[PDB]
Design a protein around this nucleic acid. Sequence first.
RNA 1: CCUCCGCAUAAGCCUGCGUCAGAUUAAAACACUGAACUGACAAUUAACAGCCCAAUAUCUACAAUCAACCAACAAGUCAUUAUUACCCUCACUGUCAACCCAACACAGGCAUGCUCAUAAGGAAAGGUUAAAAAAAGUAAAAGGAACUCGGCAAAUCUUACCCC
RNA 2: GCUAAACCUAGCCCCAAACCCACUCCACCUUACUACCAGACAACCUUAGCCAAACCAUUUACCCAAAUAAAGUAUAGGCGAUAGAAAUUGAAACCUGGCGCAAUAGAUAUAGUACCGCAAGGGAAAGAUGAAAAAUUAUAACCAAGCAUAAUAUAGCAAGGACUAACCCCUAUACCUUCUGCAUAAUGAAUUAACUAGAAAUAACUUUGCAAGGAGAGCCAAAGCUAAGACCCCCGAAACCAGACGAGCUACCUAAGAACAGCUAAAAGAGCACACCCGUCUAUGUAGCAAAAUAGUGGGAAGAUUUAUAGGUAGAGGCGACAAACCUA
Lengths: 152, 124, 113, 243, 206, 51
Amino acid sequence: ARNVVYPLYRLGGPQLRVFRTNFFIQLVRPGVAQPEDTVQFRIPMEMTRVDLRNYLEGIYNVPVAAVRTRVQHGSNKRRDHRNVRIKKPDYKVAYVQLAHGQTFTFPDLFPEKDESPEGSAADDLYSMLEEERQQRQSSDPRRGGVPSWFGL
Amino acid sequence: GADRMSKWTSKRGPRSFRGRKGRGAKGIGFLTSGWRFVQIKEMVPEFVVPDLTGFKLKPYVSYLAPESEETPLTAAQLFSEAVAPAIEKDFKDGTFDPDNLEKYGFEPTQEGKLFQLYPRNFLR
Amino acid sequence: MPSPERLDKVVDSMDALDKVVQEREDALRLLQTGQERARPGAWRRDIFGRIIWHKFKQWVIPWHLNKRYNRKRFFALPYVDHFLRLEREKRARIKARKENLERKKAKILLKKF
Amino acid sequence: PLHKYPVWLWKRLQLREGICSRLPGHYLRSLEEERTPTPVHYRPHGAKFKINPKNGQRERVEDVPIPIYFPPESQRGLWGGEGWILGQIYANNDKLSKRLKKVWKPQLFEREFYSEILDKKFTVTVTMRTLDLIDEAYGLDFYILKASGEDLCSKFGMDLKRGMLLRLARQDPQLHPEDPERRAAIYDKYKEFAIPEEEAEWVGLTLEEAIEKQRLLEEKDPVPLFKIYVAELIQQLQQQALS
Amino acid sequence: SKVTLPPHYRYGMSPPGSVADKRKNPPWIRRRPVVVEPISDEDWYLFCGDTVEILEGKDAGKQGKVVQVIRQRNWVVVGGLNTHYRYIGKTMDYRGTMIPSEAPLLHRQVKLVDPMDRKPTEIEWRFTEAGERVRVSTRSGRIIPKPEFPRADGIVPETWIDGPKDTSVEDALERTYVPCLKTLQEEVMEAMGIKETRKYKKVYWY
Amino acid sequence: TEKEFMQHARKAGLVIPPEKSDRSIHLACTAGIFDAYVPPEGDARISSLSK
RNA sequence: CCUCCGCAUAAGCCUGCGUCAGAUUAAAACACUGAACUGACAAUUAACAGCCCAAUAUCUACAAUCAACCAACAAGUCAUUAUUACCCUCACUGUCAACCCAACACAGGCAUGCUCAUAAGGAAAGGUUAAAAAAAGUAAAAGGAACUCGGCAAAUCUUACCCC
RNA sequence: GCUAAACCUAGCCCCAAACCCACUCCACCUUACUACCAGACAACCUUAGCCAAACCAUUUACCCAAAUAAAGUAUAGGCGAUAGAAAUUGAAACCUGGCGCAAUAGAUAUAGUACCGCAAGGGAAAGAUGAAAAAUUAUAACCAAGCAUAAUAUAGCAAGGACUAACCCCUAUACCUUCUGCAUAAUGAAUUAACUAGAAAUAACUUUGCAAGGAGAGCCAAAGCUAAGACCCCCGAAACCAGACGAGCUACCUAAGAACAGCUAAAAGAGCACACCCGUCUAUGUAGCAAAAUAGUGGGAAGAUUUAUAGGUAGAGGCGACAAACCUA
Ligand SMILES: [Mg+2]
Ligand SMILES: [Mg+2]
Ligand SMILES: [Mg+2]
Ligand SMILES: [Mg+2]
Ligand SMILES: [Mg+2]
Ligand SMILES: [Mg+2]
Ligand SMILES: [Mg+2]
Ligand SMILES: [Mg+2]
Ligand SMILES: [Mg+2]
Ligand SMILES: [Mg+2]
Ligand SMILES: [Mg+2]
Ligand SMILES: [Mg+2]
Ligand SMILES: [Mg+2]
Ligand SMILES: [Mg+2]
Ligand SMILES: [Mg+2]
Ligand SMILES: [Mg+2]
Ligand SMILES: [Mg+2]
Ligand SMILES: [Mg+2]
Ligand SMILES: [Mg+2]
Ligand SMILES: [Mg+2]
Ligand SMILES: [Mg+2]
Ligand SMILES: [Mg+2]
Ligand SMILES: [Mg+2]
Ligand SMILES: [Mg+2]
Ligand SMILES: [Mg+2]
C-alpha cells in the first residue's frame, strides 16, 4: 500500500502481509514495437518488481516470468497565462512477460459503431437541421439576387 | 543560474547522488561487502487475496435499494452491542467479578498478542 | 470516454469503505487501548518557533545514543520571538482587512438594496 | 491595527493562559515578586532628601542600580552581589578627554567549604564579599537559608537552599542511625524556618524546569474507555435494579 | 469533475463544465461581478417544475413552467415564454433554422401561482406542526405541494433493470455483521486458515 | 518584449445545448410540411364555380 | 568542397526538429513546413557507475620507469593474522535529444579513449550591374628600407657591437 | 478612420470594538520534501553610526511606566549648540466610519510571479460590450500625439499690418536660469496623457465676545483676556557602523587521478616541434561574433607545466614569485 507507514521489521519477526492494498495498475498499449510475450503496464511510484509479481499472481493469477520497470518523467514546459510552468504527474511503466510461453495481444474497444436507437431529445434536432438544410439549399444563379419567396 | 522552483528529483545530481535519493520505494533488504543485495522474504508485502468463487455481490448497487439515515459507528454502540449482553447475563445470575475482565475481550497491555492497535503492527 | 461516472462511483465507494474500516479500527482501539490516532507523537516546538505535531519515526536503537536524531534540535532560542510577533501582526492585518472588506460589502448591500 | 495588550504584558498573559496557569500560588507569587537587591557597587543614600551645597534647597535623591552582567561561572559557583560591570571610564578622570570602555572583574579564590545540613564538602571558587557574608551570618547554612533569591544570584545557591529546606521538612535521616542526638541537635539548630514540603519543592526552579515538573506530575497515561464504559453500565444496571 | 472556480466567476446559463463556458469567460478575464440579492436557502420558495407567471416584460400576464433554476444569480427561465430569436446552425456558406431561446429572469419578476384559481399570490414558508415543511399561501391559506421533477441522475426507479454488474436488493440489506472484539485483519487471517507462530519483538517510537 | 495577440473565437454555431444538460428546447414549429398537397392539373381551366 | 571534426565517458535544466489537427492570427530575421508552437499519443526496461563492508587484539623498511644490466634522488600511487557469530538472496537511481556556461540559434571557453583522416558531420553564393571607398589573397621594366622616429603586415631566412 | 481614447472591482490606510491562529493519510533536519542503527560540543555579553554645534575629539529627544499646568523651572552641558524631571489639585463604565481614493491613486501585490547572481537579496504593467455571447446583431459615431484622404511652387524664428484672392509689399534676433550682459556656438527639452514640488512656533496684523478682569481648574493683567483668519519647497554625491554571503573566474594550500606525437635524445628545471598553457605585433569592429574576437609572425611544451573532483583562508580582512594585483563583468 502507498502513503502508509510500514512497520519496522525486526530480525526474526513475522511475515509482512498486506490485505487491502492501495495500488492501481494501468494496462497501457505499447507505443513502439514489442514481442507477443512482453506486456506493458503502469504501476504507481511506490511499487517494485516482487510486489507487482505478487499482485499479478494473487488476484489475476497470471504467470509472470520477469519484471523490468523504469521511471517516466512527465513534461514540464507548458506555460499558463501568468508565465508559470505546468508540472505533469509522473508514473512508472512496467514490462512484464509471461511464463508458460503464452501469447497476448491488445484488442480494440471501439470498432462497433452500429447504434441507431430512438432519439427524441437529440436525434430529432439533427433530423430537423438536416431537413432544413435539404429544403433551403436551392439557390438559382439565374435569378441574379431576387428573393424566391414572392410567387408573383 | 540553476533551477530552484522545481523539486529535487533523481536526475539532478552527479554519479554520487543517483542511488540514495530514489522515488520513495520501500526497501526489502540491505547490502553486503560484495556489492550485493540481501533481500529478506519477510520484508516484502505479501498480498492476501481470498477466493472469489461463491461470492454473490456485485460492485454496483441497484436503484431499487431503499435509503436510510447515516450515523457514525462509535465505540459506545459496539460496546453496548457486544459486551453488554454478556455482562448482563453474568451479573443477573451472580458470578460477575470486577477483578478480572480478560474474558470479555479487554487486554491490559498490547505486548501479548500480535496485532496491536495503538502501536499498529499490521500494515493495512 | 463512454461512461466516466462509473470511475467516480467506484472511487467514492472505496473511499466510503476506507472511512468505515477506519472508524471501526478507531472504535476498537478506543475500546481496547483508549487513545485516538494510531500514529504516536507529541507537541514539540521546532527551531522556527512553530507548535507542530512531531510524528515518531520508529527506530531500532534508543534516542539517548542515536547520531542522526540528536542532530534534530527542538528549541526556539531567543531570536525567533521577533519573527513570531511580526507573523502575528501580519495575520492580524489580514484579519482586519478581511473584516473591513466584509463591512464594505454589507454597506454596499444595504445601500443598493 | 492595534494590539489589545501592551508588549510588556505577554509574559503575564502566557502565565495566565493554560499550562502555565496550573502552577501553585506560592511559586507564582515568588516569581512575580521582583524585589531590588542590595547595593553592592554603589553607596545608597541615607535619607530620601539630601541638602546639596551651593544652594540651600532640599531635593529628593534616589539610589539607582548598576547594570551588572552574570556569566555562567557565577551561576555554577557561589558568588555575592557582584559580577562583571560593562561600563565606560574616561582618560584622566575628566570629561574633556577620551571616553574609553573598561570592564571590571571580581577576584576568585578556589576554596573548600563544609555544609552541616548536607554533610558534604564542595569546591567553590568563592570571592571575598561572600566570605565576609558567611562570617557575618555565622556559618554557610545560615548564609544560604537567610539570603533570599535576589541575593545569591546563582543557581547552585538556590539548589542548596532547596535541598536544605527539603532535608529540614521531610525529616529524612541525614547522617545514619546509632546516634540520633546529632541529627536532633542539627534539626533544632535550624528550626526558625521549616518550610512545608508542598512549598519547598518549588524554590529556586526556573520557568522551564517548573513547566517540566508540572508536566511530569500531570502526565497520566490515558485510561482505556472500556473501564469507564463497564463502570457506567454497572452503575446504570444497579440504578435500574434497586429501584 | 472537481474543478476550482475563480472567486469572481460569472454564471451565464451554461454550466461551468462545458466548452461554451470555457469559450465565454476563460480563466484570464476578471470582469466586474454582478451583486445579487443575498437570499438564504430557507426562504427559496420557487423550485423547478411548478408553474409560474411573468410579472412584466414583452409578454406580461402569461403563464408558464420553469425548467432550470440558478441559485448563484437568482436566474429562472420559463418554458418558451419570454424568449427572443437566434440561429443554431451557422456555417460559412449557409445558415438558418431560427430556434427561439429562453431568457433568464429574477425572483422579483416571478411570482408563484396557485392551481386553484390560476392567480398570482405571494407564498410564504409556514412550518406545519405535522412534521414536514411545505409552502402555505398568505392571502388564501392554500397549500402548494412540491412539483415532481426528475433528478439529475437521468434514470427513474419505476422501470430500472438490474444489469450484469448490478446486485439485487435481498443481499445488500442482509444482516451479516457480527459485532465482536476482533480486528478485521486477524479475522480474515483466521478465517482463511493462515497461522503464525513467531511474535513481534520490542520496538521504540521516537 | 514578450506579448502576443489574444481574441480567439470562431464564427460557427455548433452543438452545445444537449451536451450533458437537463434543459431541452421548447420549439414552436416543425421542419417542413406533413404531406405535400397535389393540386389538380386542370385548375386554371376550371377556375369557375364547379364542373 | 571542408574535415582545427565526430562518436563515447565527465559536468548540466530535464522531454527541448517523432506522429496527429490547427496551420485564419501568432515566433522563421522571406518561403516550404519547422531546431525560436498550442493540445493529445510515449519513448529510456541493465549486465553500465553507484547504493557497500559484524567485532575484539595483532601484522605490513628492499618503489614505479617493459624491470632483467647499470644508474640514482624529489625517498615513493596499492598486501594480513587468531578467535566469536552469521547457510534468508538479485531490490533501488538514469539510459531520448540537434543538449552546457556567457541576456541569444554568439568567429568565446570545456576534462579522457577511439582512425589524427577516415565508415562521423556540414554548405563561403537569394537574384541582378561592376559605381567610388575600405578589408583579405598572387606578382611586376631599374634601385632593394633611398618613405616612415624606429625593418610597421608581408616573403627571403639573417652577421656583428653596446646597455640592462 | 486606422492607430487607439473614458466605462468599476479585487480592494487598498487609519479609527472604535475584539486579545488572533496553527495534523485528512504519507514525507520534512543527510543531498528538508530521503522509513530503518553506537560519543552524547552547540544561547546566557556596554549596540554602533549619521547629523548638529558651520570642523571636531565632551555633547546630540529615540530609553516603550496614558492627558494637562507646573515647565521648558531648578538642573546637566568645550556652562554651548542642546537635554530635561520631580513634590502638587487632577484623568465619566456600553453604540458598526471616512467633508480618503478607484489600477501611473490607494499595500509591491491577481504576486512576493517572471527575471538577475552559486549565494543573501532586488523585483515591475495585468482585469472594461451586454438583462438574456445558449443575442457573434450591426452598429451610434464625433476630441491628443503618427499617417493616407489632400506632397512640393522664390525669400528666409515661421509672426504681425493689411487688400477682391496662399505667396509676392514693410516691420520684427525662440522659451526659463546661474549671469552687469545669452537665440547666441552655455545649461534643459520630440509630442501627447497621468503624477510631482511652501508642511510650522514666540513675537506681530485684522475681526467678534467679555472686561479691572479674561479664560471650561493650571496662565496673563498699571486696558486687559479669549477665539478666528494670516506663514515660511522639491530632487540630486562620494563617506561610516551594525546583521548576514561568497575562493565553482581568479591568489594560496590539501587528498586521490589524468595529459605531453616525432627528431636531436651531450647527463640536463636541454632545443625544434602535435595536441595543450599565456598572448609581443600587423590588419578587421568599437551599439561588433564577443560588456575583450579573428591567422601567423610568438615563449614554454619531462616540469617553478596544465587540468577533471572535493574541502579550507573575507573586509578593524583573505591572499600576494609585491602588480595597492585579485576577492563573481
Ligand atoms: Mg545514450
Ligand atoms: Mg555576452
Ligand atoms: Mg558524410
Ligand atoms: Mg549560404
Ligand atoms: Mg547577396
Ligand atoms: Mg617590382
Ligand atoms: Mg630613413
Ligand atoms: Mg616583421
Ligand atoms: Mg557637524
Ligand atoms: Mg509627576
Ligand atoms: Mg498599483
Ligand atoms: Mg506597483
Ligand atoms: Mg489627431
Ligand atoms: Mg521678407
Ligand atoms: Mg516657468
Ligand atoms: Mg548652472
Ligand atoms: Mg560669465
Ligand atoms: Mg543654445
Ligand atoms: Mg554652465
Ligand atoms: Mg540637447
Ligand atoms: Mg579552488
Ligand atoms: Mg602567482
Ligand atoms: Mg626543456
Ligand atoms: Mg621549447
Ligand atoms: Mg611597487
